[PDB]
Amino acid sequence: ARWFPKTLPCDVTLDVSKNHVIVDCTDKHLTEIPGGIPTNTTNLTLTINHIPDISPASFHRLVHLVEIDFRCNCVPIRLGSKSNMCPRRLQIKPRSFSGLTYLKSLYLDGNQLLEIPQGLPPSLQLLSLEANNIFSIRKEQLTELANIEILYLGQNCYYRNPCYVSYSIEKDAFLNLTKLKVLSLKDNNVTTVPTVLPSTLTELYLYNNMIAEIQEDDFNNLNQLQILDLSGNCPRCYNAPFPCTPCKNNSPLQIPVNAFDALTELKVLRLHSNSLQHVPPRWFKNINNLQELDLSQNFLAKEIGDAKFLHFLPNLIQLDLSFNFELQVYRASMNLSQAFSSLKSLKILRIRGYVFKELKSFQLSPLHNLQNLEVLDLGTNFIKIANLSMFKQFKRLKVIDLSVNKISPVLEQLYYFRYDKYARSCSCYKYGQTLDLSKNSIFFIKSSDFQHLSFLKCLNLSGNLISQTLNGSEFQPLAELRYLDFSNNRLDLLHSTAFEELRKLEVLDISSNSHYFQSEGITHMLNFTKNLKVLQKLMMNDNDISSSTSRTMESESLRTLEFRGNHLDVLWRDGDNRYLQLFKNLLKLEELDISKNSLSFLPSGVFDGMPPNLKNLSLAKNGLKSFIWEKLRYLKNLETLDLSHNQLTTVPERLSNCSRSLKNLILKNNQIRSLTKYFLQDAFQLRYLDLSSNKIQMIQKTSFPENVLNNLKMLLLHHNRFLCTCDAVWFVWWVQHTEVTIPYLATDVTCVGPGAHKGQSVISLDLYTCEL
Amino acid sequence: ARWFPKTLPCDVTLDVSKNHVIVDCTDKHLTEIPGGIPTNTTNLTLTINHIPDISPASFHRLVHLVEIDFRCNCVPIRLGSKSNMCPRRLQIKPRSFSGLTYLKSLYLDGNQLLEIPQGLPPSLQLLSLEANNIFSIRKEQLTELANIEILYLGQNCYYRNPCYVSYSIEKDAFLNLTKLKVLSLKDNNVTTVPTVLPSTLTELYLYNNMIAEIQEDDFNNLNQLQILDLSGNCPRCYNAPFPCTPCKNNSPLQIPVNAFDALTELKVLRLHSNSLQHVPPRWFKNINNLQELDLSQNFLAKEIGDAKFLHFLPNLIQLDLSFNFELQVYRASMNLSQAFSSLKSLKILRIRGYVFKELKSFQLSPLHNLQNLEVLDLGTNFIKIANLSMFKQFKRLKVIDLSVNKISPVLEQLYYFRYDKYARSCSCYKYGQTLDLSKNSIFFIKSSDFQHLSFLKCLNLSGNLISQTLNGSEFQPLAELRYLDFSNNRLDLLHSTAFEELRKLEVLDISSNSHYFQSEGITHMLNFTKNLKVLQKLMMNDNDISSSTSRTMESESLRTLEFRGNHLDVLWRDGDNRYLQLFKNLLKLEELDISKNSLSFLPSGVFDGMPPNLKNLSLAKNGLKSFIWEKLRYLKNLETLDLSHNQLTTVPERLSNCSRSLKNLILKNNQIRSLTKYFLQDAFQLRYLDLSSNKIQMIQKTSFPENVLNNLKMLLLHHNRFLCTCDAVWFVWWVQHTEVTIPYLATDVTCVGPGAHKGQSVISLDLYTCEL
Numbered sequence A, B: 001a002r003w004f005p006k007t008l009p010c011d012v013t014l015d016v017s018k019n020h021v022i023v024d025c026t027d028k029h030l031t032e033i034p035g036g037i038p039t040n041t042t043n044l045t046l047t048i049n050h051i052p053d054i055s056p057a058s059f060h061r062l063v064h065l066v067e068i069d070f071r072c073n074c075v076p077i078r079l080g081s082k083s084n085m086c087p088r089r090l091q092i093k094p095r096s097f098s099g100l101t102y103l104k105s106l107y108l109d110g111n112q113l114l115e116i117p118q119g120l121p122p123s124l125q126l127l128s129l130e131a132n133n134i135f136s137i138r139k140e141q142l143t144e145l146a147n148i149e150i151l152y153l154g155q156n157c158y159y160r161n162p163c164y165v166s167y168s169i170e171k172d173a174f175l176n177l178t179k180l181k182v183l184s185l186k187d188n189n190v191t192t193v194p195t196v197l198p199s200t201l202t203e204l205y206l207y208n209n210m211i212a213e214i215q216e217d218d219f220n221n222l223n224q225l226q227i228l229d230l231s232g233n234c235p236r237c238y239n240a241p242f243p244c245t246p247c248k249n250n251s252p253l254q255i256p257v258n259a260f261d262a263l264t265e266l267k268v269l270r271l272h273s274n275s276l277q278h279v280p281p282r283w284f285k286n287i288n289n290l291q292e293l294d295l296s297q298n299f300l301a302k303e304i305g306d307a308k309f310l311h312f313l314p315n316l317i318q319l320d321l322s323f324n325f326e327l328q329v330y331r332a333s334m335n336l337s338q339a340f341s342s343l344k345s346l347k348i349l350r351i352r353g354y355v356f357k358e359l360k361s362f363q364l365s366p367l368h369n370l371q372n373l374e375v376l377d378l379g380t381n382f383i384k385i386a387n388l389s390m391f392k393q394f395k396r397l398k399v400i401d402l403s404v405n406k407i408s409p410v411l412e413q414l415y416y417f418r419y420d421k422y423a424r425s426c427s428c429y430k431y432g433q434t435l436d437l438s439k440n441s442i443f444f445i446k447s448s449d450f451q452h453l454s455f456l457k458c459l460n461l462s463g464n465l466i467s468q469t470l471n472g473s474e475f476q477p478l479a480e481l482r483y484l485d486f487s488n489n490r491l492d493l494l495h496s497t498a499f500e501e502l503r504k505l506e507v508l509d510i511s512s513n514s515h516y517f518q519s520e521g522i523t524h525m526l527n528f529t530k531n532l533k534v535l536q537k538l539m540m541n542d543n544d545i546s547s548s549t550s551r552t553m554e555s556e557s558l559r560t561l562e563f564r565g566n567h568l569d570v571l572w573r574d575g576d577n578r579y580l581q582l583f584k585n586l587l588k589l590e591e592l593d594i595s596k597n598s599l600s601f602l603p604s605g606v607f608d609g610m611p612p613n614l615k616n617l618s619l620a621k622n623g624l625k626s627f628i629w630e631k632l633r634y635l636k637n638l639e640t641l642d643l644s645h646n647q648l649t650t651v652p653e654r655l656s657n658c659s660r661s662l663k664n665l666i667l668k669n670n671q672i673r674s675l676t677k678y679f680l681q682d683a684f685q686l687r688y689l690d691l692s693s694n695k696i697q698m699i700q701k702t703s704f705p706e707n708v709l710n711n712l713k714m715l716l717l718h719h720n721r722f723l724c725t726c727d728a729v730w731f732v733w734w735v736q737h738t739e740v741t742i743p744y745l746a747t748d749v750t751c752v753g754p755g756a757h758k759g760q761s762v763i764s765l766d767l768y769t770c771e772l
């Protein structure tokens, strides 16, 4: 019990080690900077509110600020919400920041500013002005930034935030910023590389602009540069998901053979979507240290068969040559130059979108002696034919990616095609060697398909066309396999011996194999688990399972079963007792997800039929309208119960008399109108309680004893129907004074009434008239 | 417009032609019979309420009743709701019905009654007592029913409603019911056919019981019998979705060879799930008239190859032999006896679940000269091989059904396996010859697959594995095809010539082909419609479409496009204008469904890009948060606008000023809190307005002018947040007195407040204190 309730609508955190006082008002529907921000505040975040102006009054007392993050209070129209459009650009009055003598970082992105704010203090190292309307950079406006190290100025002139002219940078605008390390002028309608830049630069971002030519002297003095990105100048526009204008005459970005001669420290060079047709070896004459080269989205199909430049790249770790195919050509095979065999240090090679019919072992020979190679990505190639046995020569790899091909007998889903993959907003690999054949056209498998692949630890066959009864013979070579992803196929579980040859299998995913489960009368052996002696996790979600020939699933090893998106309602049809012990003999089961099974009620017998060590149970999203809480007594190890998104109207009379073990109880999104008188009495093991999005009007102390409440890690109460009368005096006082974490106090823990108090936050509620 | 507002919570309808006054109180959450039921009431329905008793008071004034339907006021526990269980059986006091001199039909199903109710009037023709607890029938209890024609007594003793003993029927119980035509004793735990039954019977239902044997004289005197159902006596229990006990020693229902000799009028004989191994021809010696025979779910696999009995069935119209397979046998081929060729009158033949590998032309030769044959169903057979050309000999058929097989180069989904398909609760065929290959394993198609099939009007390929670029060559022989269902495949629309060879195609479904639309960078030609010159309807739902190589779809014929479940939000990304005319050149488009496209706002240009004759537009389920109503002015022929299930908060100031053509406006399930002052002023075209499930508090007269309300066919206002204060005087009076059709007045047009009035129906609201 606090003496001084916190009324500030911001989260406040103390890191006493670094003398930091962190005040986070992100997304609090503020129209002004709140009063009462601590005087010792060092980090203030006001991102995503609607504060229309800054003034000397804004940060007057806050002389210790090292960081102000004031992003996105007035976002450009095409980037922002159309339902609450910002009426007018952010107004910054003079002298708003000059008193902030300690200020090291100022983020003003996304405020529709017209100029670089002046009057900035000389302590400043980082200034961020992305997604404003600043499209002319003048030396005079940069004087104030003598000590600046990091300067983000991109996204001020592009299709989502147009300025309708070419960007302008004055000659030498940046040269006297003698500490400047990082400069980003991406997405800006820039026409030439600005010169001369300070020789202190380590990173220069010039991507997504209109630079048609690099001058031979553009990067001459940049002997500390580590990252250079020039991508998206003369873009390759085929199937671009954004408005795309190529350089005329089908020209590439014109880079002189000596343009990079000064860049002795360069580790990263990105030349994505520059419409390049050749890669001159001479580019790399004085760069020995290069680690990452991106040449995706050019027209380098022919060059890949020649590629003399690779002889200059013995320290390269990553090479990307994806999407270099020649339009309207479907090549017979892949032609990799012998020069690839020079890439001594290569760990990652990506060649998506080369677009060819047949992959053959001899085509990968240039890679045979790359000892460090960990990832080979040949996805999205429309490969029809590939003998998988070729990968016996690639046992050292971590991931072989043939995803999205047409074979028959982790990068973001948008990655190569998106406009700016580093734009800022307001998995089985860890098991060992992985062969990813997801999203192919495999319709039938047999043992011989996997000959010589016994070293594989993860096989991903998700999203193939496999419509086959498995009998234990199809995967015989895969003696080491620990993870099989068989999701999104048409498994037919006619035989209980399915998968038994995978003797080291720990995780099996057969989710989204609903096809044979959808048609009446068909045999399904759900007892196939018995044979899998180290199986830890089974996923069988979204299989629409409503019938089973076997009555029990069996396993001595299984710990986790996901059974979401089935029809246990039909299996457990009231009057039919036959499947009430379906999961009972999964003796080591700790986690069971039976959400989304249309269970509007639970027949008696379900809880008695649960296996004895069940710890985490989800019954979410079932339309459940009633629930006999007493039956939780059968679940002696139960720690997490998820009943979210149902239609429950009551809680147990005594949660302690239903379950002694329960730590996490999730009742969000139900129809609960009141709590029982002694609901939480003596529930000392309770740690997490979600009652949000219900219809609760009143809570009294008997239901919510203080010796239970003060031990919760989290208590969620938001989006209820609290009635703020004199009867609510205890709850209101308790909420205002507690240290228990209750999220959304500042925003969605609100009185609905009476009258005067409607829409008011309970945190701000003054009930003195109740005590007169 | 009314002087006497209707307060009765039942719908009341007049059919003056048959002198009927129909009062329907179905599902009105009634706990008593309401007062004020009209004295002239002829049909009274009180089904699905919680009225706990009937007495002389119940129907006292209602002397003209011809029908009382009082079903399901206390349903058996396993059949009923578990959230509102019925506490005690319905109580009927003496003399409750004897005054109802005209009563012809009494339904008392599903009330947990213990006996046949006595004191019934002699006018009664139909009595229904299904799903009660009456399991002993005595002659004495039936004397009141001298005039009874129809008697339903089933579902009184079975697994969903157990009685724990065998059913008992006294000897000759029914014999003196000399007008009895229809008797149903299904689902009753009956052990013998009751005898002697009255010779006036036309239909006898004895299915789902424990009859082990028919005696030779059980049906001797039933010379008027038309329908006999003995199914589910000695059931075939393999994969039964209900608890199933077979007769011992695998015995069939034992039927003597002469058991049916008296049944000269018999038209329908159902012997489903009787575990039959033979069908003696002698059964049918004296039945010439038989039209329908069901022999599904027996063990007749061998008999189908012999089938001498078919020689006695020259008038049979329908024959069902589905699910006769031998357990654990997968036959090479199907062996139909030559005797099938004697089925001169046959229209429908179903043989699902025979379970065989290969279908060959010669196997169907016994059917070649059945001239009347219209439907051939060989679904659910696990057929792997079938030359589709064989169906050139079957051009006279209406439907050829090979659904749910494994072929590679309309009955309810539960039908053959369900317990009782006639249990009572409380498509392209019309285009002509149909070949249904849905739910097969076809992975690649070519022209020659359809050789000799040019007569087909509808082809169903839904749910195959077709992952192929189509180029206009794959369907060349299908010259007459009007409907292609290509849904649930993996169409790759690389070429705009896809489907062009289907020159007569009127409807194309390519819904749920999302696979190639889900991976970035892939080419997709949505302009493939240009070539299809009679195409009327295109469905491309749930394709996840977020990119297109072509900018415009084109067609001179298309009238209906379904484009639901895509990502128009990504295609029309704010700042990208390229796809704003995607639909503009569908010049004859009248119907466009762009629901479920994540459209949280509509970019400007969308409405100007719509084609000119658009009449019906759905933007439902988009998360729409704002809407510029004025843009509706571009849609000059707009008649239906569906904006349901969005997050709109306001209506236009003047709908008339946004659209002159709009007739139907659907705003249900939005967040509207108030209407604009003059919302409907001069909206003379408006005919239908749905404002249900919003948050409206008050409506005043200005918003709703009488000269618009007078032309409304329907105005939906239920599930709002009406505040019943003195400011609501107009709305409350208007609702009570209007003739405009407003559904759910009895149930869901309710005050939320203030206090006293909470949960009260507005129809019942008395505001006299406002006028004092």
Ligand SMILES: *[C@@H]1O[C@H](CO)[C@@H](O[C@@H]2O[C@H](CO)[C@@H](O)[C@H](O)[C@H]2NC(C)=O)[C@H](O)[C@H]1NC(C)=O
Pocket (backbone or CB within 6 Å): A022, A042, A043, A066, A067, A104, A105, A125, A126
């Ligand atoms: C508070 O503000 C300071 C100043 O911007 C932040 O300091 C940065 O912290 C990380 C450590 O995780 C470093 O790698 C950066 O280089 C630091 N920058 C400077 C300029 O000191 C600090 O992280 C902020 N803390 C918050 C918001 O919690």
Ligand SMILES: *[C@@H]1O[C@H](CO)[C@@H](O[C@@H]2O[C@H](CO)[C@@H](O)[C@H](O)[C@H]2NC(C)=O)[C@H](O)[C@H]1NC(C)=O
Pocket (backbone or CB within 6 Å): A157, A158, A159, A161, A162, A163, A164, A165, A166, A167, A189
């Ligand atoms: C990028 O700069 C160009 C000019 O280099 C802008 O193009 C001009 O736009 C105006 C108004 O749209 C036209 O009337 C001029 O004719 C254009 N000039 C040229 C030379 O193209 C372009 O809009 C700028 N891009 C962005 C996104 O703001």
Ligand SMILES: *[C@@H]1O[C@H](CO)[C@@H](O[C@@H]2O[C@H](CO)[C@@H](O)[C@H](O)[C@H]2NC(C)=O)[C@H](O)[C@H]1NC(C)=O
Pocket (backbone or CB within 6 Å): B157, B158, B159, B161, B162, B163, B164, B165, B166, B167, B189
């Ligand atoms: C159908 O009738 C049989 C009796 O013919 C019922 O089975 C008996 O049930 C009692 C109580 O469960 C048992 O003690 C007897 O052993 C059973 N007898 C036999 C012969 O099986 C059965 O309960 C009835 N079915 C239903 C659905 O009520």
Ligand SMILES: CCOCc1nc2c(N)nc3ccccc3c2n1CC(C)(C)O
Pocket (backbone or CB within 6 Å): A469, A492, A493, A494, A516, A521, A522, A523, A524, B326, B327, B328, B329, B330, B353, B355, B380, B382
């Ligand atoms: C009407 C079918 O009844 C059971 C059944 N289930 C399957 C099944 N899940 N898959 C099958 C695959 C090939 C052949 C037969 C079957 C099969 N069958 C047929 C059977 C002979 C029993 O295997």
Ligand SMILES: CCOCc1nc2c(N)nc3ccccc3c2n1CC(C)(C)O
Pocket (backbone or CB within 6 Å): A325, A326, A327, A328, A329, A330, A353, A355, A380, A382, B469, B492, B493, B494, B516, B521, B522, B523, B524
């Ligand atoms: C990275 C791929 O970009 C374009 C494309 N789209 C498809 C497509 N939808 N399907 C294909 C099928 C076979 C071979 C090539 C393609 C193909 N291709 C390759 C192309 C050469 C244009 O045909």
Ligand SMILES: *[C@@H]1O[C@H](CO)[C@@H](O)[C@H](O)[C@H]1NC(C)=O
Pocket (backbone or CB within 6 Å): A302, A304, A305, A306, A335
């Ligand atoms: C591979 O590519 C190079 C292009 O420089 C070409 O000279 C060579 O003939 C090609 N080999 C094959 C097998 O196509």
Ligand SMILES: *[C@@H]1O[C@H](CO)[C@@H](O)[C@H](O)[C@H]1NC(C)=O
Pocket (backbone or CB within 6 Å): A387, A388, A389, A390, A392, A451, A452
């Ligand atoms: C696949 O490659 C292996 C050699 O690693 C060989 O045994 C096998 O015969 C090849 N398969 C086919 C189908 O050519």
Ligand SMILES: *[C@@H]1O[C@H](CO)[C@@H](O)[C@H](O)[C@H]1NC(C)=O
Pocket (backbone or CB within 6 Å): A403, A427, A428, A429, A438, A439, A460, A462, A463, A483, A485
């Ligand atoms: C397998 O590939 C699919 C589809 O590409 C992906 O979503 C899935 O997570 C992968 N599976 C595993 C286990 O990594």
Ligand SMILES: *[C@@H]1O[C@H](CO)[C@@H](O)[C@H](O)[C@H]1NC(C)=O
Pocket (backbone or CB within 6 Å): A471, A472, A473
């Ligand atoms: C499993 O199927 C394969 C053919 O795909 C066959 O070789 C084998 O005999 C089958 N195994 C058993 C145990 O029946």
Ligand SMILES: *[C@@H]1O[C@H](CO)[C@@H](O)[C@H](O)[C@H]1NC(C)=O
Pocket (backbone or CB within 6 Å): A496, A525, A527, A528, A530, A531, A549, A550, A551, A552
């Ligand atoms: C699985 O299902 C049933 C018993 O419930 C039986 O037909 C089959 O032999 C069983 N197989 C295993 C591995 O338990």
Ligand SMILES: *[C@@H]1O[C@H](CO)[C@@H](O)[C@H](O)[C@H]1NC(C)=O
Pocket (backbone or CB within 6 Å): B020, B022, B042, B043, B066, B067, B104, B105
């Ligand atoms: C009214 O009851 C009579 C007699 O049962 C019946 O024939 C008629 O269909 C009923 N009408 C309606 C509308 O339910």
Ligand SMILES: *[C@@H]1O[C@H](CO)[C@@H](O)[C@H](O)[C@H]1NC(C)=O
Pocket (backbone or CB within 6 Å): B302, B303, B304, B305, B306, B335
């Ligand atoms: C098919 O079936 C019957 C078995 O009932 C057998 O007598 C007959 O010879 C078989 N005929 C053919 C053509 O296989």
Ligand SMILES: *[C@@H]1O[C@H](CO)[C@@H](O)[C@H](O)[C@H]1NC(C)=O
Pocket (backbone or CB within 6 Å): B387, B388, B389, B390, B451, B452
């Ligand atoms: C299918 O049968 C037809 C005769 O109707 C014949 O032309 C064709 O050869 C058969 N096709 C195949 C692939 O066997």
Ligand SMILES: *[C@@H]1O[C@H](CO)[C@@H](O)[C@H](O)[C@H]1NC(C)=O
Pocket (backbone or CB within 6 Å): B403, B427, B428, B429, B438, B439, B460, B462, B463, B485
């Ligand atoms: C085609 O078959 C599927 C069932 O497999 C069914 O859902 C669909 O409605 C049928 N299509 C048509 C046009 O009848």
Ligand SMILES: *[C@@H]1O[C@H](CO)[C@@H](O)[C@H](O)[C@H]1NC(C)=O
Pocket (backbone or CB within 6 Å): B471, B472, B473
């Ligand atoms: C279309 O595809 C078929 C078979 O794949 C082939 O016969 C034909 O060459 C193709 N037509 C065109 C115009 O490419």
Ligand SMILES: *[C@@H]1O[C@H](CO)[C@@H](O)[C@H](O)[C@H]1NC(C)=O
Pocket (backbone or CB within 6 Å): B496, B525, B527, B528, B530, B531, B549, B550, B551
């Ligand atoms: C479809 O789209 C592209 C232009 O994006 C064009 O090449 C192609 O010929 C068009 N086809 C038709 C049938 O209009």
